[PDB]
C-alpha cells in the first residue's frame, strides 16, 4: 500500500494528451507493412509543392478555370498593372485555398519565404517583359510601376524559359506572423506591371495568359495547431 | 527498462512502458524527418537551379 | 529545423536561378538569396508541430448517440466510420492511404428526464460499451445473452470516474487503410462504388447495465478517435466542397475560392 | 592633468563638449550595436548609412520656467523629420537604433534647480477620458517638445493624454522613474546629462512610425529659481544621436 | 545569501564613502561599515523567496464566467487576457517584457437554481473547456460541430474530481511577451493604441456536455494562471493609480502617497 | 495493478503548489530567445535602486512634485528640525510608495540596512551643514539636536559632492521585522537638524530644496510572500 | 533518469519528469542569481565609493 | 546546358533577366569600385548606402516609332528623384557612382530595327 497523493489534473481528459492506454486486442498480429510510393513525413513537404493560384478571383470566374488565368494583353503603353494581391498566404482569398493556404489554415502562426512561379502561356511568337515586385508594408501599395520600382522586384523577360520565379523574402518585425489577419502582423503587397508592352507578330494572338504557382521555401514553418474554418457541419453525415 | 529522451525546447523525460502491446504505447511526436524531393522535383533528369531548364 | 539564409551580394552572370520551365512538373527551388542580396540569418525555427503525428494525433469526436433508462432506445449501436464527422475526416483525407493505431476515449454523460414520477432517488449508473467484430452475434435487446462478452471486448464504466480509454491496433487486412477507393465490390463492376466497399470495422453497442432510478434518464456516448503511430502515403488536395454523405465522395460543386473585385484589389470582399 | 567634469563625444560630423558633467549613463549596461545573424529574422540585407544617420541631431530648445511641469519627446518620432535618419526611416519597413541623448542646460552660481532626465522604454500613456486612447497628435511631437501638465487634464470626450506630471502620464509614481536609465541636471553641480540607450524591444527590429520604443522625459523635481538680476531666460537644448542604425525592407516612401 | 557586516573601527581620512553626486544616475553603495563602527555579523539571510520565479509563480484567478443548464447562456467564451484582474496584472507589470510558460488550473463549480420544477434528481455534470486559437471556427451554440475539437485542444472534466490542469508554452510571436506597447497597429499611426494591438491569444469556450437534470443548474468556471519558468526584462515603477480598463493604461490621477501632518510627524494620519 | 494508497491532500488545489502538468500544445516550437537589455533576476535588484522619497507628504503636496521637495532655508539659529519620519519602509506613508516600499508590501518580513542619499538642490553659492541622525526605539524621537546627537548620526557638509548618504544600520532585537507595523518590531526615528544655518551671498536665493532617495543595502532581504494592500478591484476590468 | 537536488534549508529531493515537453515541467524556484549593477551603477566611467564623485 | 544568350543581374532588391543578349559591355574595361585613400581629397568619412542606393531603378518607358529620331538621359540627373539615390544626392555636396545600364526592347520575328545604346562621358551639348 504505497502512499500516493493526487495533483490537480486527475481524471481529466485533455484532447491533446499523450498517454498509454491498455490494448483492447492483445497479441493481435498486424498485417505486415508494404512500401507504398510517396510517403509524407511532414506537412511542409506538401506546402513546398507548387499549386496553381486563382489570381482572377473576380466575380464568377471563381466558379471556373478562369480564376486561374492572369490576362496579359498587347497595350498602347507600359507601366500598367497586371495584378495585385497582399502577402497573406492563409487569409487572402487568392492564397487561402491553395495547397499552402489550406495547410496554413490548420495553424495559427507562420514564418518563411514563398515562391511565386509565373508561367507564360502565350504563343511561341509573343514577347514581353514584366516587373514582378513585392513592397513591404508601411506606405500603401505601389500604384505606379515607379513606386513598385523601389521595392523588391525581378524583371521577367519572356523567352524559352517560360516561367520566372519571384521569390518573396521574410521581411518582418517579428519571428512569425498570424495566419489570420492582424495589422500588427501586416505582410506587404505583390504587384505586377508591364515593363515593355507585349509584342506579337502578325497572325499570332495578342492576348495571352499567365499562371501563378505558390510553394513554400526551405525556411517556411507553421506553428500553433487549430481547426480550419473551411469545413462545417450541421448533422452527422449519413 | 526505461528510456530517457529529450524534451521539446527552444532536459530529459524518462519513459517506461507497462503494456505488452506496441499499440498501447504513446504517440511518436518527435520524428522531424522530411523529404519534399518526392513531390518537389519528381523529374527523371536532374534540374539544376542556375541552368536553363529547357536547353 | 528550418534553413538559414546565406549572405548574398550583387551578381552579373548568365546563371539564371529565377528562370525555369514549370512544364517539367518540377517545383522550383529558388530561395531569397537567389533573387536579391540576403543577409546571413540563423534559423532555429522548427517544423516539429507539422509532422504527420502532431497533425493527426489529437482526440476528435467522430460520432455520438443516445440510449435510455426505459422505453425503446435502451441500448445503442454504431457501425464504425470516421466519415460522419467533417473535422477528422477531412484531415485523414489529405492522404490516400493512412496506417495507424487508435486511442479510444469515450465521454458518457447522462441527463435526468422530465417525468411525473415522484420520489426519484437514482442509484449510480454503470455503462457497458461492447464491440462486435464483423460476424459476431448482435444484441437485439438490452438483455440478450450477447452482452456476456465472453470473447468480444467490452468496457464497463461507472459514472463520475475518469473517461474509459483503450487503444486498438491497425485492424486492416490491407497493408494500409484505404481512404479512397475508385472501384466496386463486385467483379462485374457493380454493386457498391467507393470507400464503403472497404469499410467493415464492425459495430459498437452501448447500454446501461442498471436503470438506477424510478425516473427516466437518457445517456449520450461520445466516441473520440486519436490516430497514434501514424504513417500516411500519397497526399492529395484538401476537401473543397462540403461533405454530403458519410459513405461517398458526393459533393455539391462550389467555386475555387471566395471573391474580391479587380485582380488589383488588395482586399477580400 | 585630467577632470571627471570634462567630456567630448564625436559622432559623424558632430562633436559635443561638456565642461561640467556626471558620467555617461550607459543604457542598461548595454552599449548600442548591430543585429546578429543569430537574432535576425528579416532575410534581406540591411542599409547601415553610418556617418549619415548616426550623428548629433540638435532638436529645438525649450524654456525652463519657474512653473514648467516637464516635457517629453517620443524617440523614433522626433528625428523622424531630421536629415537622412528621417529619410531611411520612411523608405524602410523595419529599423533598429540606439541613441546618445545629450540634454544641455546651463545656468549660473546664483541659479538653482534640478531636472530628471529619463529614458522610459515603452512609455505607453493614458487618456484623460478613461474610455478613449490618446490621439497620435496628442502623444507625439516631432522635434517639438510635448509638455506635461501642472494639474489633472479634464476627462470630457477627448483623446487628450492625462499629462499630470506626478503620474507621468502613465499612472505610476513620478518619483520611481529612477529605474529607467537617467541623470539629473542639478544646476548647482551639473551642466548636462548624457544617456547612451541600447536597443530595447521584444522583437529584433520594428517599424519606426507605428511604434516609439523609448520616450525621453525632462521633468524638473526642484524648480528654477534665482534672485532678480540673475538672467531669466534659461533654455534646455536636446541633442540626440542615433547609434548603429540598420534598415531592412526597402519600398516606396511613407507610412500608411 | 545576504552580505555579512565587517567589523569597523574609527577613521580620520580624506576618504569619503558618504559624500557623492547623485546626479550621475548611479545608486550609492554605502553600507553601515562606512559611516559608523560596525561589528562583524555573519549573514545567513537568503534572498530566495524574492527571485522572479517565486514572486510570479503562484496561481492567481485571472477571470471567471457562468454558463447554464438551459436558456441562452448555455456555453461561455472569454478572450484571453491577464489584464482583467488587478492582482496578477500588477505583478507582471513590474516588468516591460516577460517571457514564460503557463500552468492553467480551472475551478469549475455548479449551483442548483430556483425553479418550480418538481422531482429533480440530477445526474453528474461533465464540462468541456475548449481553446479556439486566433483564426479557428467559433461555437455559435452549445451544439455546433465546432465542439468536436478534432484539432483544437480541449478538457473534458466530470464534477467531483480534482481541478483540470495543463501547462502551455510561450505562445508569443515575439522573443518575449510585451506588457506595454507605446504604439499603434496601423502604420498610419492610427487604429488601436497600446497593448491591445498586441493581444491575440484567442478565445476560450466552456459548456456542459450534459444538462444532467430537469431543474436549472448554473456553473462558474474560474481560470487560474501561474507563470512557470519566468524571464523578465526592463523593470518599471509599480502601478500607483487604480486600473480603469482591461485594454489600456487608462488611469485616473492620484496623489504620490497618503498624508500625515508636518514633515516632522512621526505618524501616518 | 500496483497497490497504492492515498494520503490526505489528494485532489486538492494548493495555489502555491509546484507540480508537472501535461502540455496542451505538444512539440510546439517556441520563438527563439533574444537578449533584451536589463534583465531582472531577483526583486532585490530593484529595491537596491534609489527612488525619490516624498518626505513632504503634508497636505495636498502629495498631489504634486512638492511631496518630493524638502524645504531648507536660511534661519536665525541652528538646531532646528528639517524633517522626521520613522523607520518603517513598508508602512510609513513616506516609504510605502517608494520602489523599496512597493516591493516590501508584497512580503511580510524584512531585514537589512537602508541608504538615504540626500541631494542639495540649492544655488552653487549656498553652504550649510546638517545633522542627519537615526535614533533606535526605546525612548521617544529626539526633539532637540542635542538628543539626536547621541544617536547614529552623520554631519553633512554641503559642497561639491552635492549628496550625502546617511546609512541606517540594522539594529534590531530580532532577525527580521514586520513590514506592517507592530511595536514589538519597532524601528526607530530618522530626523534632520541644522548644524550650522544655511549661509548664502547677496543676490543668491536663501531658500533651497533637498531631495531624499531610498535604496536597500547588500544585506537587505524580504520574506513571507503576501498580496499588496495597494491594488483593489470591484469588477473585472473591461 | 532522475535528478537529486537540494531542498531549501536554514537533504535532497529526487525528481524525474514524465512529459515530452519542457513546458510541462515544474517551476525554477532555486535560481538565486542576481546582478543589481545594471540598475545600481549603470554609469560609463567607474565610481569608487571612497573617492569624490565629482572631481 | 548553357547559352551566351541568357543572363541574370542581381543588385540589391532587384534582379534582371534576359533570354536574348550580347555580352555585358564593361565601361572602359573598368568595373566600378570605391575611391582609394591614394586618390582622395575630401577628408570627411563617406556614406556608402549600399543596397539602398546601388539597385535597379527602372525609369519611364518610351515608344519606339517608325519616325523616332532618338532619346537621351543625362546621368546623375535621371535618378536624382528616384529613391534613396536621389536623397543622398541632395544632402551631400560630393558624390561618386558607376552604373549598370540595362536598356530593354523586345519585338518579334516579323519586326525589324536597330538601336545604338551609347554612354557618352561628358556630352556637352
Ligand atoms: C470496446 C472496443 C472498441 C474497439 C473500437 C474499434 C474501432 C475500429 C476503428 C477503425 C478505424 C478507422 C478506419 C476506417 C475504415 C475503412 O474505411 O477502411
Ligand atoms: C484548453 C487549452 C487552454 C489554453 C490556454 C491558452 C491561454 C493563453 C495565455 C496567454 C498568456 C498571457 C499573455 C498576454 C498577451 C499579450 O498581451 O501579448
Ligand atoms: C527498468 O524499468 C528497471 C527499473 C524499474 C523502475 C521501477 C518501475 C516503476 C513501476 C513499473 C512497473 C511496470 C508496470 C506494469
Ligand atoms: C531513470 O529514471 C531510471 C530509473 C527509473 C525509476 C522508475 C521510474 C518511476 C516511474 C516512471 C515512469 C515515467 C512516467 C512517464
* Domain CATH code at residue G32: 4.10.80.10
Per-residue CA distances from D113 to D24, F19, F129 (Å): 21, 55, 20
**Which cell numbers hold the place of A86?**
497582399
CA atoms of H74 and A14, how far apart (whole Å):
71
For B20, which of A18, A26, A38 is closest by C-beta distance? A26
The distance in angstroms from the start CA to the end CA of chain G is 60
CA A50 to centroid of chain Cα atoms: 9
**Which cell numbers hold the place of G37?**
549593477
Distance (angstroms) between ligand 4 centre and the Cα of B18 equals 11
Phi, psi of C108 (to 5 degrees): -95, 120
With a Cβ cut-off of 6 Å, ligand 2 is lined by E 80, 82, 102, 104, 129, 131, 153-155, 168, 171, 177-178, 195, 198-199, 201, 204; F 24
CA atoms of G28 and D74, how far apart (whole Å):
37
Residue reference for cell 528579416 = D42
CA atoms of F189 and F83, how far apart (whole Å):
11
Q: If DSSP codes are grouped into helix, strand and coil, which group holds residue C148?
A: helix
Q: Does ligand 4 lie within 6 Å of residue B25's CB atom? A: no
Contact A36, C176 (CB under 8 A): yes
DSSP structure string for E194-250 = SGGGT----EEEEEES---SSS-EEEEEEEEEEEEEEEEEEE-PPP-SPP--SSS--
G 1-55 residues with CB < 8 A to E: 8, 10, 21-32, 34, 39-43, 47, 49-54
Structure letter (DSSP) for residue A66: G
Smallest CA separation from ligand 3 atom 12, residue: B18
Contact call for B38 and A45, based on CB within 8 A = yes
Distance (angstroms) between ligand 3 centre and the Cα of F24 equals 26
Distance (angstroms) between ligand 4 centre and the Cα of B16 equals 6
Report the candidate in D146, D174, D149 with the shortest Cα–Cα distance to residue D164.
D149
For G28, which of E26, E53, E168 is closest by C-beta distance? E53
Structure letter (DSSP) for residue E70: S
A3 touches chain B (CB under 8 A): no
Residue in chain C nearest H19 by alpha carbon? C19
Ligand nearest to the CA of B18: 3
**Fold type of domain D1-256:** Jelly Rolls (2.60.120)
Per-residue CA distances from E246 to D130, E89, E104, F233 (Å): 11, 9, 20, 12
Report the candidate in F42, F184, H87, F21 with the shortest Cα–Cα distance to residue E49.
F42
CA atoms of F67 and E240, how far apart (whole Å):
15
G17 touches chain F (CB under 8 A): yes
Report the candidate in F186, A60, A171 with the shortest Cα–Cα distance to residue D94.
A171
Q: Measured at the alpha carbon of residue H32, what is the angle toward residues H29 and H36, in degrees to the nearest 5?
A: 110
Domain coordinates in residue numbering, chain A: 1-238
Structure letter (DSSP) for residue D206: B
CA atoms of C56 and C58, how far apart (whole Å):
6
Assign 3-state DSSP to chain G and report helix, strand, coil percentages, each to 5: 5, 20, 75
CA atoms of D79 and D57, how far apart (whole Å):
7
Q: If DSSP codes are grouped into helix, strand and coil, which group holds residue C56?
A: helix
Which three-class secondary structure string do you get for A91-119? CCCCCCCCHHHHHHCCEEEEECCEEEEEE
Taking the CA of residue C71 as centre, how many other CA atoms within 13 Å lie in the half-sphere pointing to its CB? Answer: 14
Contact C158, E124 (CB under 8 A): no
CA atoms of G38 and G43, how far apart (whole Å):
9
Helix (H) or strand (E) holding H86: helix H83-91
Per-residue CA distances from A209 to A55, A189, A205, A212, H72 (Å): 12, 21, 11, 10, 34
Structure letter (DSSP) for residue H44: S
Per-residue CA distances from E162 to A7, E153, E179, F7, F11 (Å): 7, 19, 32, 14, 4
Contact A53, H34 (CB under 8 A): no
E167 touches chain A (CB under 8 A): no
CA atoms of B47 and B41, how far apart (whole Å):
8
Whether chains H and E touch (3+ CB pairs under 8 A) is answered by: no
Taking the CA of residue B45 as centre, how many other CA atoms within 13 Å lie in the half-sphere pointing to its CB? Answer: 5
Structure letter (DSSP) for residue E7: P
CA atoms of C9 and A98, how far apart (whole Å):
33
Q: Does ligand 4 lie within 6 Å of residue G19's CB atom? A: no
Contact F126, F135 (CB under 8 A): no
Experimental resolution (Å)? 3.5
Distance (angstroms) between ligand 1 centre and the Cα of C240 equals 26
Q: Does ligand 3 lie within 6 Å of residue B22's CB atom? A: no
Distance (angstroms) between ligand 4 centre and the Cα of G24 equals 16
**Which cell numbers hold the place of A47?**
506546402
**Which cell numbers hold the place of H90?**
541632395
Per-residue CA distances from C246 to A237, C60, D17 (Å): 5, 16, 82
Q: Between the CA atoms of C14, C18, C20 and C26, what dihedral angle is there, to the nearest 10 degrees?
A: 130
Q: Give chain D positions within 8 Å (CB) of F52.
A: 175-176, 178, 221
**Which cell numbers hold the place of G53?**
564623485
Minimal Cα–Cα distance from B8 to chain F, Å?
Answer: 6
Smallest CA separation from ligand 2 atom 10, residue: E201
Q: Give the start-end residues of each E strand in chain D.
A: 7-11, 14-18, 25-26, 57-64, 71-74, 92-104, 111-121, 146-147, 182-186, 192-197, 214-226, 234-250
Q: Give chain F positions within 8 Å (CB) of A9.
A: 19, 21-22
Q: Give the start-end residues of each E strand in chain A.
A: 2-4, 12-14, 39-40, 52-53, 70-73, 81-86, 107-111, 114-120, 129-135, 152-157, 163-168, 177-178, 189-196, 207-216, 221-225
The distance in angstroms from the start CA to the end CA of chain C is 37
CATH of domain A1-238: 2.60.120.20
Q: Give chain B positions within 8 Å (CB) of G20.
A: 5, 7-8, 13, 29-30
A236 touches chain B (CB under 8 A): no
Question: Residues for chain G: how many in total?
Answer: 55
CA atoms of G38 and H16, how far apart (whole Å):
50
Smallest CA separation from ligand 2 atom 18, residue: E199
**Which cell numbers hold the place of H35?**
575611391
Q: If DSSP codes are grouped into helix, strand and coil, which group holds residue H5?
A: coil
Residue in chain G nearest F21 by alpha carbon? G24
Contact B3, B17 (CB under 8 A): no
Smallest CA separation from ligand 1 atom 3, residue: C131
Contact H61, A78 (CB under 8 A): yes
Report the candidate in D186, E236, E20 with the shortest Cα–Cα distance to residue F69.
D186
Q: By residue range, what is the domain housing residue G9?
A: 1-55
Smallest CA separation from ligand 2 atom 14, residue: E81
Report the candidate in A154, E215, G19 with the shortest Cα–Cα distance to residue H102.
A154
CA atoms of D112 and D108, how far apart (whole Å):
8
What strands lie across the sheet with F221-225, from one edge to the other?
A: F177-178, F107-111, F221-225
| Residue to test with chain F: of D130, D175, D178, D217, most F Cβ within 10 A | D175
Q: Give chain E positions within 8 Å (CB) of A182.
A: 134, 185, 200
Q: Give chain D positions within 8 Å (CB) of F160.
A: 189
CA atoms of C85 and C104, how far apart (whole Å):
15
For C165, which of A21, A50, A102 is closest by C-beta distance? A21
Per-residue CA distances from E199 to D170, E192, E202, E245, E247 (Å): 19, 11, 9, 14, 9
Q: Residues 6 or more apart from A143 whose CB is under 8 A from it?
A: none
Contact G36, F44 (CB under 8 A): yes
CA atoms of A156 and A178, how far apart (whole Å):
31
Q: Residues 6 or more apart from D249 whose CB is under 8 A from it?
A: A136, A138, A171, D42, D44, D92, D93, D94
Q: If DSSP codes are grouped into helix, strand and coil, which group holds residue E12?
A: coil
**Which cell numbers hold the place of D134?**
490618446
Q: Does ligand 3 lie within 6 Å of residue B51's CB atom? A: no
D256 touches chain C (CB under 8 A): no
| Residue to test with chain B: of C8, C13, C29, most B Cβ within 10 A | C29
* Domains held by chain B: number: 1
Contact call for A8 and F11, based on CB within 8 A = yes
Contact A31, C170 (CB under 8 A): yes
Pairing type for strands A70-73 and A207-216 reads: antiparallel
Tell me the H-state helices in chain F.
44-47, 99-104, 145-148
Report the candidate in E242, E205, E203, E206 with the shortest Cα–Cα distance to residue E85.
E242
| Residue to test with chain B: of F27, F30, F33, F34, most B Cβ within 10 A | F27
CA atoms of E209 and F175, how far apart (whole Å):
56
CA atoms of E166 and F94, how far apart (whole Å):
43
Q: Residues 6 or more apart from F233 whose CB is under 8 A from it?
A: E85, E86, E87, E243
Helix H83-91 crosses helix D83-91 at what angle (to 10 degrees)? 180
Q: Give chain A positions within 8 Å (CB) of E186.
A: 183
Instruction: Identify the architecture of domain E1-269 in CATH.
Output: Sandwich (2.60)
Smallest CA separation from ligand 2 atom 17, residue: E199
Q: Could you count the other beta carbons within 10 Å of the beta carbon of residue D200? A: 23
Amino acid at each position: 500500500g504505497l502512499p500516493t497523493m493526487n495533483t490537480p489534473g486527475s481524471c481529466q481528459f485533455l484532447t491533446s494528451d499523450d498517454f498509454q492506454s491498455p490494448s483492447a486486442m492483445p497479441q493481435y498480429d498486424v498485417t505486415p507493412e508494404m512500401r507504398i510510393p510517396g510517403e509524407v513525413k511532414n506537412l511542409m513537404e506538401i506546402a513546398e509543392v507548387d499549386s496553381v493560384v486563382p489570381v482572377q478571383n473576380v466575380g464568377e470566374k471563381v466558379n471556373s478555370m478562369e480564376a486561374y488565368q492572369i490576362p496579359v494583353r498587347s497595350n498602347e503603353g507600359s507601366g500598367t498593372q497586371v495584378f495585385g494581391f497582399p502577402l497573406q498566404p492563409g487569409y487572402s482569398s487568392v492564397f487561402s485555398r491553395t495547397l499552402l493556404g489550406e495547410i496554413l489554415n490548420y495553424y495559427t502562426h507562420w514564418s518563411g519565404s514563398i515562391k511565386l512561379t509565373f508561367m507564360f502561356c502565350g504563343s511561341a511568337m509573343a514577347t514581353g517583359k514584366f516587373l514582378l515586385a513585392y513592397s513591404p508594408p508601411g506606405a500603401g501599395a505601389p500604384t505606379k510601376r515607379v513606386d513598385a520600382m523601389l521595392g523588391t522586384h525581378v524583371v521577367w523577360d519572356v523567352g524559352l524559359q517560360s516561367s520566372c520565379v519571384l521569390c518573396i523574402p521574410w521581411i518582418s518585425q517579428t519571428h512569425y506572423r498570424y495566419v489570420a489577419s492582424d495589422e500588427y502582423t501586416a505582410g506587404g503587397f505583390i504587384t505586377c506591371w508591364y515593363q515593355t508592352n507585349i509584342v506579337v507578330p502578325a497572325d499570332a494572338q495578342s492576348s495571352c495568359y499567365i499562371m501563378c504557382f505558390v510553394s513554400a521555401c526551405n525556411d517556411f514553418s507553421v506553428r500553433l495547431l487549430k481547426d480550419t474554418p473551411f469545413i462545417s457541419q450541421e448533422n452527422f453525415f449519413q | 527498462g526505461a528510456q530517457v529522451s529529450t524534451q521539446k525546447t527552444g532536459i530529459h523525460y524518462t519513459n517506461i512502458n507497462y503494456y505488452k502491446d506496441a499499440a498501447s504505447n504513446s504517440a511518436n511526436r518527435q520524428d522531424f524527418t522530411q523529404d519534399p524531393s518526392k513531390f518537389t522535383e519528381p523529374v527523371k533528369d536532374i534540374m539544376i537551379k542556375s541552368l536553363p531548364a529547357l536547353n | 529545423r528550418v534553413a538559414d539564409t546565406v549572405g548574398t551580394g550583387p551578381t552579373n552572370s548568365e546563371a539564371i536561378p529565377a528562370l525555369t520551365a514549370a512544364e517539367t512538373g518540377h517545383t522550383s527551388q529558388v530561395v531569397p538569396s537567389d533573387t536579391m542580396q540576403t543577409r546571413h540569418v540563423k534559423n532555429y525555427h522548427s517544423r516539429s508541430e507539422s509532422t504527420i503525428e502532431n497533425f493527426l494525433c489529437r482526440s476528435a469526436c467522430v460520432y455520438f448517440t443516445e440510449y435510455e433508462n426505459s422505453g425503446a432506445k435502451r441500448y445503442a449501436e454504431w457501425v464504425i466510420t470516421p466519415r460522419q464527422a467533417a473535422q477528422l475526416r477531412r484531415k485523414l483525407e489529405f492522404f490516400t492511404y493512412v496506417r495507424f493505431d487508435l486511442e479510444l476515449t469515450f465521454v458518457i454523460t447522462s441527463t435526468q428526464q422530465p417525468s411525473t414520477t415522484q420520489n426519484q432517488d437514482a442509484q449510480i449508473l454503470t455503462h457497458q460499451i461492447m464491440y462486435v467484430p464483423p460476424g459476431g452475434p448482435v444484441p437485439d435487446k438490452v438483455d440478450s445473452y450477447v452482452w456476456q462478452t465472453s470473447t468480444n471486448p467490452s468496457v464497463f464504466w461507472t459514472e463520475g470516474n475518469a473517461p474509459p480509454r483503450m487503444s486498438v491496433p491497425f485492424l486492416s487486412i490491407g497493408n494500409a487503410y484505404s481512404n479512397f477507393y475508385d472501384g466496386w465490390s463486385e467483379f462485374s463492376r457493380n454493386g457498391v462504388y467507393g470507400i464503403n466497399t472497404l469499410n467493415n470495422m464492425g459495430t459498437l453497442y452501448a447500454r446501461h447495465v442498471n436503470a438506477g432510478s424510478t425516473g427516466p434518464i437518457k445517456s449520450t456516448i461520445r466516441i473520440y478517435f486519436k490516430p497514434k503511430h501514424v504513417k500516411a502515403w500519397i497526399p492529395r488536395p484538401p476537401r473543397l466542397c462540403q461533405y454530403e454523405k458519410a459513405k461517398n465522395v458526393n459533393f455539391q460543386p462550389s467555386g475555387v475560392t471566395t471573391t474580391r473585385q479587380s485582380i488589383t484589389t488588395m482586399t477580400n470582399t | 592633468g585630467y577632470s571627471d567634469r570634462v567630456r567630448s563625444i564625436t559622432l559623424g560630423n558632430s562633436t559635443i563638449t561638456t565642461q561640467e558633467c556626471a558620467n555617461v549613463v550607459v543604457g542598461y549596461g548595454v552599449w548600442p550595436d548591430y543585429l546578429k545573424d543569430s537574432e535576425a529574422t528579416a532575410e534581406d540585407q540591411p542599409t547601415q548609412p553610418d556617418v549619415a544617420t548616426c550623428r548629433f541631431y540638435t532638436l529645438d530648445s525649450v524654456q525652463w520656467q519657474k512653473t514648467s511641469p516637464g516635457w517629453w519627446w517620443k524617440l523614433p518620432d522626433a528625428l523622424s523629420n531630421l536629415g537622412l535618419f528621417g529619410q531611411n526611416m520612411q523608405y524602410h519597413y523595419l529599423g533598429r537604433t540606439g541613441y546618445t541623448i545629450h540634454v544641455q542646460c546651463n545656468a549660473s552660481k546664483f541659479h538653482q534647480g534640478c531636472l530628471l532626465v529619463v529614458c522610459v522604454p515603452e512609455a505607453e500613456m493614458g487618456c484623460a477620458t478613461l474610455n478613449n486612447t490618446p490621439s497620435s497628435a496628442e502623444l507625439l511631437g516631432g522635434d517639438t517638445a510635448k509638455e506635461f501638465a501642472d494639474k489633472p487634464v479634464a476627462s470630457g470626450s477627448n483623446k487628450l493624454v492625462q499629462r499630470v506630471v506626478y503620474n507621468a502620464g502613465m499612472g505610476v509614481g513620478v518619483g520611481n522613474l529612477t529605474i529607467f536609465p537617467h541623470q539629473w541636471i542639478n544646476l548647482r553641480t551639473n551642466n548636462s546629462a548624457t544617456i547612451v540607450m541600447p536597443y530595447t524591444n521584444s522583437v529584433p527590429m520594428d517599424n519606426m512610425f507605428r511604434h516609439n520604443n523609448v520616450t525621453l522625459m525632462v521633468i524638473p523635481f526642484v524648480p528654477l529659481d534665482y534672485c532678480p538680476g540673475s538672467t531669466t531666460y534659461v533654455p534646455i537644448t536636446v541633442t540626440i544621436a542615433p547609434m548603429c542604425a540598420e534598415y531592412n525592407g526597402l519600398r516606396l516612401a511613407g507610412h500608411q
